[PDB]
Design a protein around this motif. Structure first.
Motif, PDB file in Angstrom:
ATOM      1  N   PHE A 103      -5.448 -56.698 -20.516  1.00  0.00           N
ATOM      2  CA  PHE A 103      -5.355 -55.234 -20.744  1.00  0.00           C
ATOM      3  C   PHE A 103      -4.012 -54.833 -21.324  1.00  0.00           C
ATOM      4  O   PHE A 103      -3.786 -53.639 -21.575  1.00  0.00           O
ATOM      5  N   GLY A 141      -9.212 -47.387 -14.636  1.00  0.00           N
ATOM      6  CA  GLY A 141      -8.860 -46.583 -15.805  1.00  0.00           C
ATOM      7  C   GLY A 141      -7.429 -46.201 -15.928  1.00  0.00           C
ATOM      8  O   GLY A 141      -7.110 -45.182 -16.552  1.00  0.00           O
ATOM      9  N   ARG A 157     -21.030 -50.765 -12.819  1.00  0.00           N
ATOM     10  CA  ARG A 157     -20.611 -49.491 -13.372  1.00  0.00           C
ATOM     11  C   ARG A 157     -20.883 -49.509 -14.885  1.00  0.00           C
ATOM     12  O   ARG A 157     -21.363 -48.505 -15.436  1.00  0.00           O
ATOM     13  N   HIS A 158     -20.445 -50.546 -15.598  1.00  0.00           N
ATOM     14  CA  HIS A 158     -20.607 -50.622 -17.049  1.00  0.00           C
ATOM     15  C   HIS A 158     -22.105 -50.721 -17.369  1.00  0.00           C
ATOM     16  O   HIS A 158     -22.500 -50.116 -18.386  1.00  0.00           O
ATOM     17  N   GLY A 178     -13.635 -45.030 -18.029  1.00  0.00           N
ATOM     18  CA  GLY A 178     -12.325 -45.541 -17.565  1.00  0.00           C
ATOM     19  C   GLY A 178     -11.423 -45.936 -18.721  1.00  0.00           C
ATOM     20  O   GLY A 178     -10.397 -46.600 -18.471  1.00  0.00           O
ATOM     21  N   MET A 179     -11.708 -45.533 -19.972  1.00  0.00           N
ATOM     22  CA  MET A 179     -10.699 -45.673 -21.039  1.00  0.00           C
ATOM     23  C   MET A 179      -9.483 -44.778 -20.761  1.00  0.00           C
ATOM     24  O   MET A 179      -9.592 -43.649 -20.229  1.00  0.00           O
ATOM     25  N   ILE A 180      -8.328 -45.237 -21.251  1.00  0.00           N
ATOM     26  CA  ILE A 180      -7.123 -44.416 -21.394  1.00  0.00           C
ATOM     27  C   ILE A 180      -7.206 -43.791 -22.788  1.00  0.00           C
ATOM     28  O   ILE A 180      -7.012 -44.489 -23.797  1.00  0.00           O
ATOM     29  N   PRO A 201     -20.128 -57.013 -19.038  1.00  0.00           N
ATOM     30  CA  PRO A 201     -19.384 -57.378 -20.228  1.00  0.00           C
ATOM     31  C   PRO A 201     -18.475 -58.590 -20.051  1.00  0.00           C
ATOM     32  O   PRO A 201     -18.065 -58.882 -18.935  1.00  0.00           O
ATOM     33  N   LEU A 245     -16.424 -54.203 -22.601  1.00  0.00           N
ATOM     34  CA  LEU A 245     -15.786 -53.378 -21.559  1.00  0.00           C
ATOM     35  C   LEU A 245     -14.926 -52.301 -22.175  1.00  0.00           C
ATOM     36  O   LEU A 245     -14.073 -52.585 -23.015  1.00  0.00           O
ATOM     37  N   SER A 297     -13.515 -49.810 -19.792  1.00  0.00           N
ATOM     38  CA  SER A 297     -12.630 -49.493 -18.646  1.00  0.00           C
ATOM     39  C   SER A 297     -11.297 -50.186 -18.867  1.00  0.00           C
ATOM     40  O   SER A 297     -11.372 -51.412 -19.151  1.00  0.00           O
ATOM     41  N   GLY A 298     -10.189 -49.453 -18.781  1.00  0.00           N
ATOM     42  CA  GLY A 298      -8.829 -50.039 -18.792  1.00  0.00           C
ATOM     43  C   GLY A 298      -8.277 -50.256 -20.172  1.00  0.00           C
ATOM     44  O   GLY A 298      -7.057 -50.550 -20.301  1.00  0.00           O
ATOM     45  N   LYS A 299      -9.075 -50.001 -21.236  1.00  0.00           N
ATOM     46  CA  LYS A 299      -8.624 -50.132 -22.639  1.00  0.00           C
ATOM     47  C   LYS A 299      -8.212 -48.784 -23.224  1.00  0.00           C
ATOM     48  O   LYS A 299      -8.471 -47.718 -22.619  1.00  0.00           O
ATOM     49  N   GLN A 300      -7.450 -48.845 -24.315  1.00  0.00           N
ATOM     50  CA  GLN A 300      -6.810 -47.703 -24.975  1.00  0.00           C
ATOM     51  C   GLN A 300      -7.691 -47.209 -26.135  1.00  0.00           C
ATOM     52  O   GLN A 300      -8.054 -47.997 -27.014  1.00  0.00           O
ATOM     53  N   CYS A 307      -6.435 -51.340 -13.531  1.00  0.00           N
ATOM     54  CA  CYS A 307      -6.909 -51.421 -14.917  1.00  0.00           C
ATOM     55  C   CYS A 307      -8.377 -50.974 -14.890  1.00  0.00           C
ATOM     56  O   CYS A 307      -8.742 -50.106 -15.721  1.00  0.00           O
TER      57      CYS A 307
END
Ligand code: NAD
Ligand code: NAD
Ligand code: NAD
Ligand code: NAD
Ligand code: ADN
Ligand code: HG
Ligand code: HG
Ligand code: HG
Ligand code: HG
Ligand code: HG
Ligand code: HG
Ligand code: HG
Ligand code: HG
Ligand code: HG
Ligand code: HG
Lengths: 461, 460, 461, 461
Positions: free
Chosen positions: C431, D256, C196-197, A236-238, C375, A210, A212-215, D253
């Motif tokens: 997260f 994003g 989505r992923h 959806g990454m930061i 995932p 995944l 999405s939501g990770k840095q 999260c």
């Protein structure tokens, strides 16, 4: 009885050919050139040394060069970038290719030498198609007699163009080149959109993480960094961006990214104290995009969040200090081109250790190493430019010019804007796009031909 | 002080409150104000300025004055003035002739009041222009004043086109800086400024939901790219038209369908060539070309009922508004919003369903129906304008021998190092931290640690 | 000498274990349950028949059930969804698993039968974990006696829940069930964000097609349709959405999609004349997301643009009329789970024919068939819910209750909102997310506990 | 000689009428109801007290109620939300309205009392239409005899529904209510996509600040916080989200966003030391969306970055501690509904002070205070539900029921799903959308009528 090749597995050819037939339908600019120029055979007599990722896309390029009259000898420009089904299909078509996924460095050098030499002596090459400059460098250092009869080099990528300009500045470039990279239908298509498509692809195939939501931290915001940043932000990454060029940084800010440095105040002392440990301790994914050296350094690798992914999508693996990691940390192969690198020490690790990084493609270009690089419809632009560039330099016949005439043509140039536009038009038609035709009054009002070109050479798109 | 004309001087205190906020949003321009205050590099400069009289232009004007310049100012558009900005500048004792909602005659009178002081040509020695109208009036009507002018700094794509035409024809009389093609102008203002301000203007004029509706953007240059994103980010289904196949390829890769208003892209001048099925589905058309008649009479006839029509290119003739004024009844909804009734010229049913909505009478919609680009974006453009004024004023072209003049008579951009220095102040404004190259890295890519970081060929 | 399994290749177990260790690090809710409940062995005596895609993520679920005291016998619920390294790692840990990627229907039916029977006789199963309802239906129709000893069914997916609610309304459901699908940390996590992923992932692995600039049609805009539409739009597809439910259609419009029907005015008269040929002739990709039958019908398939991709991410393959395609058109395998379907007829194809569609995974769940499904960090939510559901129904001991007590407990229910929240909190902490704690004054203001639950049962998120 | 109104300026009527005529074309669900029901006059004899933002959209709602037979008396539910041209147009149509933009609190209360009383005595009201519960509360506390003859309340907004549910649980609710908010075509349309439209709109009108590249914190991630976060993210802001509900946080999260708390570890210890001063010192914009109290407290306001914008889009201003700022800091009006709050002290300020916050609409709902609230085409859904809800309760005639029958009907209920679907269908048709009709076989397969409803009551969308 064709035997002048080396690939992983010739029995992959039928699968390769099925994928080349699909790729032709995705590459209308390149297949438009094959159709327009087949009758004229503009590359009849061309003998092309090619060193570019041996993918399905490169297969369509090679078969277009051959369809226009060329002979080729081919190698890949990266140890992990070959698609073995593509190499097998090209060998099965009677074309010399020396390439497989998972070469050693010694095998990589041997493959390039097998293109340069036919039957243990220099091939009668008269053209070079290069990606990164490795083949160009080897000819200049080891085969200067071969360069006397070569009419030109067509160079795919930013890093190769840098190498060519360095040679031209020092007076060591022996034959003229076309900078294929700086067509708009290459640089602002392939380098940007290709990485948009293929970076997240390669990270999913290698890790199934995944995003999405990770840095994420993307080092660089040139064409590759812009596409790479989008590849991750769209999932959806930061995303945070690092840059040395304040204009590129200004773009990253306006595009909605926070601009940060791995180093306090952007100053790398060389000291651990200069590392922003708080910043790097929050990053799940670092991607290098620079074409520069050691932009993901030892001190950054020590500071990254546990279980972070590290990868490079620039041309060469030295963007990341992988030598430091090979010397200090235990590498556990998860699967091909995926390693867990255990920061607990060099000799041995606990199977359930939490203090590791995941390195993709051993730091080599991750899109090609862990997936299939850019898609056919994007490589259509780059490779339509390659074919036009090969036609142009072959037709000019630099090698046959007298010395005074060579001196006037020894340059690194881009293709004319009109050709860049004609490539773009075929790409637009491939999407079913319909370009408007200027009226005579409109063409007069903005000071252009109805046929184009539509912009001045200063225009940046 | 009475050497001015504004809508309402009582708006000055409000304009000053907004200038104080804008100074905090414009670090590049305030950085120059602070860097060069001591040296007074524009001492003796007498600048004729013709650019949208907004709060952002207020900060530019006060920067020029803080660096030693005298100015006389007009707006370059009949609807772009912010009356509180014009009042604050007049209240600071700066000559300004501008209000929102000028007639064309008032527009020309304002420019003439900058050119003349107390009935006679001002001793002007610098020009700051947006669109080329002032440049053109000086060349055609006041050629003698151009003998004492050191140069022109030109803001926008359309103005630069007009400068290059003059230079081609040998009619340009003083050198110019193309401010538009700094990257911190073209790839900041033209693109991100329209991203911010196009949907802003549409909402203020109509309060229409954009999500889920169909847009057609004519053009995919810097303004068309920013305009398309302004709409797409709101959830519009955006189609893009282009004559430039490279710009069209960018639109396709950016996720837009590329279409022509004309069957096969061929406008044969007849109704039969209009793609009626396409235009009958469009709820919003936006022109971004700098070209003429790219939303023509036959397109306007074919548009879906109650479509919005607007232009964000420099001049109103992108749309055939003359056709609508001759054929159709205009109902003012509120200032700079008209319903155009397709039912006839000399009346309309108050409840008619067959109308278009035209914003700003086809004039630049961002400035006409909202406030144009935000301060933090105009900071880039205007930091370039200040650097360009300092450069051409220091060069003193009007004072050179004829032989020296002929060599300096050009339309140039600012050096990349200055573009990078403006970008760095913008980045620091966002709290961004640029990395410093190590000596080894600088050697590796062949640049100075200080920059410039890119060759002149680089397109960003 | 364990031998109570059938997998593709036991030697893949070491690779599977490496991926399972990574997956544990990505599944904090599920490994939080493994750690919280290990001491208490809440599934001591549980004998679970499980029938859910045999992925790495399902392996972490299985080993969680086992770590809390359960015995399991396991099958995959789809012929293409098994990850052979995951099945091998489970077989290697001494757990009965019958699954491999690329089963025939007959082999699928045989694997379910190997879970139900141990040594030729019904296993003493007392719990069911199902995805899609096939194992539930087989127990009800073929092994009704086994249901006398079973305490409950936990059902993963929308289609399986529809089938349970049908059985309950008809009085044919013999044991109580938990609807796992309708936890918010399942339906509004897995069904949406998982697709989505994984939808763009599967299309890229299958085809390597550029998606940017191409036209898609997504049939359905439920949770799967929503996530699928985002998968494609975020890559730069021009996405159109079809729906029968006007509320879901309203949401698609507000999300920035054009809502269209394959049929003129939305009315399928069964005739070719009712097909919107103009619309379907511009579509590059159709994705079915409905859980319904024949939403991509024969007439639609005839009208699709040449070289369109066709795929299904609903639970069962009959969303697309693949039976029509097998009867009428010629199938050319590109590679496993990728077929060109030549619309030229039955009796031979031309390798170079331009008139074909590409079908992914033979119309079966494309994300699991052509890639690896959702995932680990998304399946975390789904599978934390599965474990909680298993614990709840096993602790209630329905099979042991007197008749009048059974009648009061024979229901299809969801988990309580407090447990849905506690799963969510573990996902958020994964997260690095930090939830705010309400003050007692703020809790009183909105009528909740500082501990939650925070929302009424009516709340739709 | 109509004089039973009070508005800012009756001369704005013609402008209001021009905007009403445009709004009718943007509200097809509400104008469809006008056309469907005009002949039957289902609100003949209804006397509606209305308290809802006196916008153009509200004007179309009022004229729809009147077209269906109702008489009304109207006030706004917020001191800053009235559009004076809309109020003027309604007064000019002979409809009693008491509303202007920029009321004092004393004027606000007076306007509501002018609806309740006609010629100094209770009006013969028999219906209530409320947004936020202020009218509902006044009637219960001060006019119980008027509630005896009222058939029902139709409540617009989340905060008002919470107030009704508190009264019902305490046995103090005197008439039945429809929760209009929880139609899907209200809550998942207005609350989410309205704020997506109108938050960035209000911020640009008030400040003309560039949002791209700046840092925002959105407090809450329910329907309004989801819309708000997207309003900002789509402009290019770097958005962080705070939540107390981990399920809402898990959505943030996956969408994003980084989920953060203004307090260290999310815990308010009663002191400044528990504020994450590092986080808040980077925030350019804070938006409250919670319907809770003091979610942007004094200590958060002291810690915010210099020159940050502060605003609220939840129903009441007490989300933000504006009472602290009024007691302690100097307020400089920039222009109406925009104040600089100088944190240097109460008595005065330096004009060029850098240490200020910008507060929009004095902390009152910012979309309506600094712009025009939600657009017509979104308010169509909300207001179509309001008309259906008024028809439903007026037809039920609760006031005329004997005591034993009243007790069975005294409830807070939502409209049936079939009506929510019918509203959504008119909204979809407004966009040009085409819903598909299920075939009889497909309707049987999924267990629904071809007419709908399409989903069970448990479905969350
Ligand atoms: N993997 C692929 O398919 C692929 C595709 C195209 C190009 N490339 C390669 O990718 C690389 C980048 O190419 P490009 O066209 O984007 O180049 P570019 O010049 O457009 O961008 C590189 C960027 O790196 C930045 N940079 C340099 N040193 C830095 C540092 N220490 N920290 C942060 N930023 C720094 C520069 O300022 C520049 O903006 C090259 O090696 C090129 O050959 C790879
Ligand atoms: N409103 C603003 O604040 C603002 C900001 C910057 C520039 N401008 C103005 O906007 C205009 C565009 O500027 P730009 O910088 O984008 O220029 P540009 O040259 O980058 O782009 C214009 C585009 O229009 C296209 N085009 C021309 N004729 C066309 C036609 N018939 N149909 C379709 N496409 C057509 C061209 O191919 C080109 O790509 C100019 O007039 C400029 O001065 C306005
Ligand atoms: N592949 C995966 O990993 C995955 C994940 C979750 C669920 N699922 C499966 O996906 C399917 C859908 O699940 P869901 O949770 O989204 O269900 P859902 O009920 O939320 O959505 C299904 C949608 O299909 C629409 N629909 C039905 N018939 C239609 C038609 N003829 N045309 C257009 N739209 C039509 C319905 O109106 C509904 O909104 C189920 O089979 C479910 O088991 C698969
Ligand atoms: N301005 C508008 O036009 C508009 C539109 C619709 C609703 N509203 C109002 O907006 C408010 C929110 O409505 P909604 O429908 O989104 O409600 P909701 O219940 O859907 O969401 C509010 C959220 O706030 C969260 N929350 C509560 N206290 C918190 C805290 N201390 N920190 C962080 N998060 C916290 C809750 O967990 C919840 O998810 C209500 O007052 C409603 O009446 C305003
Ligand atoms: N599929 C592909 N086939 C061949 N070359 C590729 C592919 N994807 C990326 N590349 C090329 O890799 C180069 C870097 O060596 C880029 O400049 C790009 O043109
Ligand atoms: Hg190479
Ligand atoms: Hg290379
Ligand atoms: Hg920034
Ligand atoms: Hg001007
Ligand atoms: Hg202008
Ligand atoms: Hg296109
Ligand atoms: Hg299953
Ligand atoms: Hg299944
Ligand atoms: Hg109200
Ligand atoms: Hg209210």
């Amino acid at each position: 009885g064709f035997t002048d090749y080396k690939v992983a597995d010739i029995t992959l050819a039928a699968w390769g050919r099925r994928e080349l037939i699909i790729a032709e339908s995705e590459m209308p600019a390149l297949m438009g050139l094959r159709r327009k120029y087949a009758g004229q055979q503009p590359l009849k007599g061309a003998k092309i040394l090619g060193c570019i990722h041996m993918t399905i896309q490169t297969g369509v390029l090679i078969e277009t060069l051959v369809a226009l009259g060329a002979e080729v000898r081919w190698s890949s420009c990266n140890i992990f970038s070959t698609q073995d089904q593509a190499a097998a299909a090209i060998a099965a078509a009677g074309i010399p290719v020396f390439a497989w996924k998972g070469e050693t460095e010694e095998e990589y050098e041997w493959c390039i030498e097998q293109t340069i030499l036919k039957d243990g002596q220099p091939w009668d090459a008269n053209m070079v198609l290069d990606d990164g400059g490795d083949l160009t460098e080897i000819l200049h250092k080891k085969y200067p007699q071969m360069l006397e009869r070569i009419h030109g080099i067509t160079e795919e990528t930013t890093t190769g163009v840098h190498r060519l300009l360095d040679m031209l500045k020092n007076g060591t470039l022996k034959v003229p080149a076309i900078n294929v990279n700086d067509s708009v239908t290459k640089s602002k298509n392939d380098n940007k959109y290709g990485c948009r498509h293929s970076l997240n692809d390669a990270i999913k195939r290698g890790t199934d993480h995944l995003l999405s939501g990770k840095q994420a931290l993307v080092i660089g915001y040139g064409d590759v960094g812009k596409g790479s940043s989008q590849s991750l932000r769209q999932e959806g990454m930061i995303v945070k961006v690092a840059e040395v060029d304040p204009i590129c940084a200004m773009q990253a800010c306006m595009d909605g990214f926070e601009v940060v440095s791995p180093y306090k105040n952007g100053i790398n002392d060389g000291t651990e104290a200069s590392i922003d440990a708080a910043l790097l301790g929050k990053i799940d994914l670092i991607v290098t995009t620079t074409g520069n050296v050691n932009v993901c350094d030892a001190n950054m690798l020590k500071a990254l969040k546990k279980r972070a992914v590290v990868c490079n999508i620039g041309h060469f693996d030295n963007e990341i200090d992988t030598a430091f990691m090979r010397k200090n940390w235990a590498w556990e192969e998860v699967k091909p081109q995926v390693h867990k690198i255990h920061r607990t020490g060099k000799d041995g690790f606990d199977a359930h250790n939490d203090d590791y990084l995941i390195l993709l493609a051993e730091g080599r270009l991750v899109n090609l190493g862990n997936a299939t690089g850019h898609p056919s419809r994007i490589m259509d632009g780059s490779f339509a430019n390659q074919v036009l560039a090969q036609i142009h330099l072959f037709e000019q016949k630099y090698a046959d010019l007298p010395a005074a005439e060579k001196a006037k043509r020894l340059s690194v140039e881009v293709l004319p804007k009109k050709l860049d536009e004609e490539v773009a038009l075929e790409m637009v038609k491939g999407f079913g796009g319909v370009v408007t035709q200027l009226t005579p009054k409109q063409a007069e009002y903005i000071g252009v031909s109805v046929e184009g070109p539509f912009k001045p050479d200063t225009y940046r798109y």
